[PDB]
């Protein structure tokens, strides 16, 4: 009864019950996901309902213990995570209104239908075909149509709903001593009073705007190259001092330039590394690939699979007609019962996805000792970060020719290396300007700086200034372009895909500087080492029990995200791009327009 002994003794009970219930819920869910029937939806909805009701009751009960009389750090962190009101601080009818606006937004996004002006009877959804038209077509007219349509029919309906959504979320967040909603998102990177490891909610914006400054020397050259290359497929449509038209990037919103590899390959007659026929000519099943992944993981010094994962998991899609959503996922039903749900085919891409998923499996195996409320990554970003380095280290030619899938006399050269590096940088450094731009735009519109009659003009001037792309058609203020992105119209945070891109290469360099590697970083492997495994595992097992700025400094040695490893990873590509642009004009002028000529 030491004013705190009450917190501990509460916490225990909670712990137990929580864990148990959660498990019930989760088994239920895995079920429905692996065997789609009509009754299983009911078997899982009530389990989720009971879990949610229990958690909200415990949250309403935890309030009775003040948060300044606690002295131990871990119990304070657990209470601070549980004591969160979340929603339901609003007026009751406004809560239902918020649920309605959210669900209506999600539905209007999901079931969008756009139809041709030449044939309005049968037409296209978003997922089947629209992405294919925007990715694989090659005529300017069809791309411009597919681009303007989706923003003229799904951008116009969403604005009068997003307007109310903003103010409702702001009034929600403003009851928990917060000043807007964006702060309620940045609050994930917050650390209070640990004598030096503190990280104020504000300094996240400072880091982001301070690390985006060092990327531009590389992004500018990449933009110049991609532009001078796109000036071949569509002759006399781009200006050599202008920006790019949004409907030429490779998808609906311009998030990944990966589909531009067909037009901008450096050496179009030297094929890259690809183990796809060598696999099937060796009769590899879904079992063999996972055995290879586990062998690689155990080679570095991590434990085996739990021997309950080989009988329960579903590695190959069920033969008969058994509807199960084929989207890879790593389940941690808790209680040490880990599973992997994915419809593996015999392709090297699935061979890399297996590694990327067993990464999450290992990361979940590590921290299974912490209290139940601390079973996550250090923040939202570390999870996929620690996941992706396995795929980045398993795709190098060394690890391939050491497993029996490449001819021993396969000799790699600098041409194939530049090819691979551009294929990588079309995805890694390509999405960063878009990500930072969209997140800054959302923070701005939430804090109230941008008046609600200047949304689209500000968004497009930002697309002109930062990322270097220009709209093809004018858009007045009956539109809303950002509401046409999945992570926006569904109330999903969108800054993790910018911190992950940095944490990735920081982890890569920090780790395989212990494997005593000597060459460029893009050939670096973490196999056969034991110091690397220990350095990684001394962070994998913390969970949330320590501030993330300590989880970093125990791996790389710094107390923040630094972009230098990224540039050090791309240095060869940068040396090449500095030569292939001796005659073009780097950068872009925000005056050019595709219609004002």
């Amino acid at each position: 009864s030491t004013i705190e002994e009450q917190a501990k003794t509460f916490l225990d009970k909670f712990n137990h019950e929580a864990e148990d219930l959660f498990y019930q819920s989760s088994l239920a869910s895995w079920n429905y996901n692996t065997n789609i029937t009509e009754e299983n939806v009911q078997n899982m909805n009530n389990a989720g309902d009971k879990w949610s009701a229990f958690l909200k009751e415990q949250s309403t009960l935890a309030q009775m213990y003040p948060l300044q009389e606690i002295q131990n750090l871990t119990v304070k962190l657990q209470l601070q995570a549980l004591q969160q009101n979340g929603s339901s601080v609003l007026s009751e009818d406004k809560s239902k209104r918020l649920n309605t606006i959210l669900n209506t937004m999600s539905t209007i996004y999901s079931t969008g239908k756009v139809c041709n002006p030449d044939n309005p009877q049968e037409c296209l959804l978003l997922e089947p075909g629209l992405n294919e038209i925007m990715a694989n077509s090659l005529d300017y007219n069809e791309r411009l149509w597919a681009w303007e349509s989706w923003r003229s029919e799904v951008g116009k309906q969403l604005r009068p709903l997003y307007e109310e959504y903003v103010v409702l979320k702001n009034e929600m967040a403003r009851a928990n001593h917060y000043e807007d909603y964006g702060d309620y998102w940045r609050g994930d990177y917050e650390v209070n009073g640990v004598d030096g490891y503190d990280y104020s909610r504000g300094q996240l914006i400072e880091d982001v705007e301070h690390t985006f400054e060092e990327i531009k020397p590389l992004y500018e050259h990449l933009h110049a190259y991609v532009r001078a290359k796109l000036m071949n497929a569509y002759p006399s449509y781009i200006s050599p001092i202008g920006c790019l038209p949004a409907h030429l990037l490779g998808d609906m919103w311009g998030r990944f330039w990966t589909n531009l590899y067909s037009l901008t390959v450096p050496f179009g007659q030297k094929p890259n590394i690809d183990v796809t026929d060598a696999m099937v000519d060796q009769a590899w099943d879904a079992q063999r690939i996972f055995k290879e992944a586990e062998k690689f993981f155990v080679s570095v010094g991590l434990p085996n699979m739990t021997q309950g994962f080989w009988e329960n998991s579903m590695l190959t899609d069920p033969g008969n007609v058994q509807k199960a959503v084929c989207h890879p996922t790593a389940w941690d039903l808790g209680k040490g019962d880990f599973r992997i749900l994915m419809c593996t085919k015999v392709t090297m891409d699935d061979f890399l996805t297996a590694h990327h998923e067993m990464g999450h499996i290992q990361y979940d195996m590590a921290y299974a000792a912490q209290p139940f409320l601390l079973r996550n990554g250090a923040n939202e970003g570390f999870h996929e970060a620690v996941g992706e380095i396995m795929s980045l280290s398993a795709a190098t030619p060394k690890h391939l020719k050491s497993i029996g899938l490449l001819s021993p006399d396969f000799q790699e050269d600098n041409e194939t290396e530049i090819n691979f590096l551009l294929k990588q940088a079309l995805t890694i450094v390509g999405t960063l300007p878009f990500t930072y731009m969209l997140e800054k735009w959302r923070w701005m519109v939430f804090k109230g700086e941008i008046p609600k009659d200047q949304w689209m003009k500000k968004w497009w001037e930002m697309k002109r200034e930062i990322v270097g792309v220009v709209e093809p058609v004018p858009h007045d203020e009956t539109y809303c372009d950002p509401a046409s992105l999945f992570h926006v119209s569904n109330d999903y945070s969108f800054i993790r895909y910018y911190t992950r891109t940095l944490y990735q290469f920081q982890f890569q360099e920090a780790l395989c500087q212990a494997a005593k590697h000597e060459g460029p970083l893009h050939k670096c492997d973490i196999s056969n080492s034991t110091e690397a495994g220990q350095k990684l595992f001394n962070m994998l097992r913390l969970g949330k029990s320590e501030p993330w700025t300590l989880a970093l400094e125990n791996v790389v040695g710094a107390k923040n995200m630094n972009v230098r490893p990224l540039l050090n990873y791309f240095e060869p590509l940068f040396t090449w791009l500095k030569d292939q642009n001796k005659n073009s004009f780097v950068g872009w002028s925000t005056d050019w327009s595709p219609y004002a000529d």
């Binding site: 009864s1 009450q6 225990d12 137990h16 739990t306 021997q307 329960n312 209680k335 019962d337």
Partner: protein, 97 residues
């Protein structure tokens, strides 16, 4: 499967036990300062929970069975001892018996 809620295990008590002692009470715990009067809720917790076992658990959570033996010689001089066995008997030979 579905949970076998028979086996309980106490996780609230005033002070730790004594060796070889046994406690089976079901008096509602009291952590706060206000007496409970035998009603669960705020700072009045039931003292017994149950292991919910299922076949799809990992090692370290599946039910193990434990037995322990303990000897003590209060003073007995000829109690239960170990056993013995065979060794072919012969006759008409000088032998060590």
């Amino acid at each position: 499967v579905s949970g076998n809620y028979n086996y309980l295990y106490r996780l609230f008590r005033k002070s730790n036990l004594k060796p070889f002692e046994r406690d089976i009470s079901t008096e509602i715990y009291q952590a706060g300062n206000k007496p409970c009067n035998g009603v669960a809720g705020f700072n009045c917790y039931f003292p017994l929970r149950s292991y919910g076992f299922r076949p799809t658990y990992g090692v370290g959570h599946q039910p193990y069975r434990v037995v322990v033996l303990s000897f003590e010689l209060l003073h007995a001089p000829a109690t239960v001892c170990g056993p013995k066995k065979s060794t072919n008997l012969v006759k008409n030979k000088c032998v060590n018996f």
